Amino acid sequence: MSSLVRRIISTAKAPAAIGPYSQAVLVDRTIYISGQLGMDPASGQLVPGGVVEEAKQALTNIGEILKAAGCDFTNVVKATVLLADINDFSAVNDVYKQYFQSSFPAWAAYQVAALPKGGRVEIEAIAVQGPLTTA
Amino acid sequence: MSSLVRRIISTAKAPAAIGPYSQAVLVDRTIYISGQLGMDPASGQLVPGGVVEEAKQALTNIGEILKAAGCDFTNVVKATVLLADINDFSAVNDVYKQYFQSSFPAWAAYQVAALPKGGRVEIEAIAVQGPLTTA
Amino acid sequence: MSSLVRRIISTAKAPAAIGPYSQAVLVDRTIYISGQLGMDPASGQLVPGGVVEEAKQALTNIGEILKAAGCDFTNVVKATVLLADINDFSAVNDVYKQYFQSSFPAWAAYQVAALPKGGRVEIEAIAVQGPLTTA
């Protein structure tokens, strides 16, 4: 069979790994992006201000990883939004909507028991490397 | 590179979006289906009767989304079953089994802290558009 | 369109199914592996010793499923690590690192409310059937 391209995506514009994972893996045309917390890329510390600020930073981090792979938010096809508190659903929704301005991904959003570093939100994503033709 | 097909799947036979997501995204041949709660498509209210009734409605909803994409349950390759209570595992298993009557998908099933709308179960799925040849 | 290969992966070297799922599904070149607990393949009982021993057994189980599909850990592109306790993150990380000795997968790791069988850890994975060419 054909040898499919598998590339580790890595950018200093997103946080360093806090463990045994890659920021994202591109395989064939699919990009699996690791769960992102609202961590500042330079410090690796959660940004202050709680879930809204954290959600913004997490999505900014995903954006930088997408850019490293020659993609943007239009390439995302599935997202998972993990919350520390289900009462934050509406607030996070309003943040998320600002990044996906068409062809909204499939998703799931729900509350887990706890995230690393005491994070209030973690977002995972799957993207597909372009070009994509959307009818 | 080739421009891959990316299509938003949308049917009025499944619940309207309660937020910034598509019911499903078809990209190349893979269909990412959003997490479905046991919501009535017409009202958008959770069906009464608790987890068993909700599980049935959620799977019915996935079925309608699959149909919109020219697929059925035989096309599902991976499911995720999110529970509000791990004690409901056996009950949900018995519901789920009635929809997948061969070539059972890969899966994960476990308890989360909370689902949207106070749901007792949420099911996500990945399918692949046919034809599929199963040896 | 072409008829894509869909194959159920099954090995007696990994635990029997405790419900309506396949150990893994290969579709085209992507392998979706079901969530694995730290269950002994012969008995179907969780191994003693808590999360570290369970994590080792779960990863051993994934390894046997990969082998059945003609793959190994180098083929894994995304993992999900579900914990019963976020305080176990560092311990599980140290176990996991021993299995992935290059080209680390994308991942997400976090605490859920409860796993089947009172498990302390469950690991899901996505792999891509080789050959893969890593630059």
* CATH at A44: 3.30.1330.40
Q: Is the residue at A135 inside a domain?
A: no
First to last CA, chain C: 31
Please give the Cα distance from B51 to B34 (Å, whole number).
19
The residue range of the domain holding C122 is 6-128
Contacts of C98 (CB under 8 A, 6+ apart): none
Distance between CA atoms of A65 and A61, rounded to whole angstroms?
A: 6
Chain C hits for B129, CB-CB cut-off 8 Å, are 1
- B133 inside domain: no
Mutation site, B110, B112, B133, B134, interface C, largest C CB count within 10 A: B110
A99 CA to centre of own chain: 11
Q: Does a structural domain hold residue C133? A: no
Q: Considering just the CA atoms, what is the radius of gyration of chain B in Å?
A: 15
Whole-angstrom distance, CA of residue C66 vs CA of residue C60: 10
Rounded to an integer, what distance in angstroms lies between the CA atom of residue C8 and that of residue C22?
A: 7
Q: From CA B45, how far away is CA B39, in angstroms rounded?
A: 5
Question: Would you call B108 and C34 a contact, using CB atoms and an 8 Å cutoff?
Answer: yes
Among partner residues A89, A104, A133, which is closest to B21 by beta-carbon distance? A104
3-state secondary structure of B134: strand
What residues form DSSP beta bridges with C132?
A: A4
- Method of determination? X-ray
Amino acid letter at A54? E
Residue A35, φ and ψ in degrees, nearest 5:
-55, 130
In a domain, B11, yes or no: yes
Comparing CB atoms, the residue among C8, C23, C113 nearest residue B103 is C8
The candidate with the shortest Cα–Cα distance to B61, out of B119, B104, B102, B107, is B119
SS3 C36: strand
What is d(CA A115, CA A88) in angstroms, rounded to the nearest whole number?
A: 15
Resolution (A): 1.7
- Cβ-based burial of C74 (10 A; exposed 0-12, middle 13-18, buried ≥19): middle
CB of C131 within 8 Å of a chain A CB? The answer is yes
Whether residue A124 lies within 8 A of chain C, CB to CB, comes out as yes
Structural element, H or E, at residue A1: none
Give the count of domains, chain C.
1
Contacts of A28 (CB under 8 A, 6+ apart): A4, A5, C29, C128
List alpha helices for C18-115, DSSP H.
Answer: 51-68, 89-97
* Bridge partners, residue A51, by sequence: none
- Where in chain A does DSSP place strands (E)? 4-9, 24-27, 30-36, 76-83, 106-111, 121-128, 132-134
Sign for the CA dihedral angle at B124, C115, A58, A25 comes to: negative
Bridge partner residues of A5 (DSSP):
C133
In sequence order, which residues have a C-beta less than 8 Å from that of residue A10 and are 6 or more positions away? A22, A23, A68
Q: Which residues on chain A are in Cβ contact (under 8 Å) with C113? A: 112-113
CB contact under 8 A, C110 and A27: no
Minimum-distance CB partner of C110 among A27, A32, A116: A116
Residue A35 is given by DSSP the state: E
Distance CA B100, CA B106 (A): 11
Cis peptide before C48 (omega within 30 of 0): no
C-alpha span between C59 and C9 (Å, rounded): 16
Three-state secondary structure call for residue B76: strand
Tell me how far CA of residue A114 lies from CA of A28, A110, B110, B125, C85, in angstroms.
33, 12, 15, 24, 8
| Distance between CA atoms of residues B75 and B130, nearest Å | 7
Q: Helices H, strands E: what count in chain B?
A: 2, 7
Contact status of C112 with chain A (Cβ, < 8 Å) = yes
Q: For tokens 């749901």, name the residue.
A: B119
Give me the helix-helix angle, C89-97 and C51-68, nearest 10°.
40
Q: How far is C79 from chain A (nearest CA, A)?
A: 9
- Chain B, 47 to 76: residues with Cβ < 8 Å from chain C are none
In a domain, A134, yes or no: no
Mutate to test the interface with C, among B89, B101, B107, B115 (most CBs of C within 10 A): B107
For the sheet with C30-36, list strands across it.
B132-134, C4-9, C24-27, C30-36, C121-128, C76-83, C106-111
Which of C25, C20, C31 has the alpha carbon at shortest distance from C9? C25
Chain C: give the shortest CA distance to residue B12, in Å: 27
- Tell me the sheet residues that pair with C127: C31, C76
Q: What DSSP line would sit under C119-134, residue for residue?
A: -SEEEEEEEE-S-EEE
Rounded to 5 degrees, what are φ and ψ at A22?
Answer: -95, 150
Q: Cβ separation of B106 and C32 shorter than 8 Å?
A: yes
Cβ proximity of A36 and A122 under 8 Å: yes
B124 touches chain A (CB under 8 A): yes
Residue C135 lies in a domain: no
Closest CA to B123 of B94, B86, B92, B101: B92
DSSP state at residue A47? P
The C-alpha of C98 sits at a distance from chain B's nearest C-alpha, in angstroms, of: 24
Q: Which chains share 3+ C-beta pairs under 8 angstroms with B?
A: A, C
B22 in a domain, yes or no? yes
Question: Are the C-beta atoms of A85 and A75 separated by less than 8 Å?
Answer: no
Q: How far apart are CA A66 and CA C85, in angstroms?
A: 31
CA-based nearest residue in chain C for residue B76: C25
Separation between Cα atoms, residue C71 and residue B130, nearest integer Å: 25
Helix, strand or coil for residue B26?
A: strand
Q: Are C92 and C81 in contact (CB under 8 A)?
A: yes
Q: Tell me, yes or no, whether A48 lies in a domain.
A: yes
Rounded CA separation C66/B78 (Å): 16
Q: Look at residue B109 and give its three-state secondary structure.
A: strand
**DSSP annotation of C113:** S
Chain B to chain C Cβ contacts (< 8 Å)? 97
Minimal C-alpha gap between C16 and chain A (Å): 28
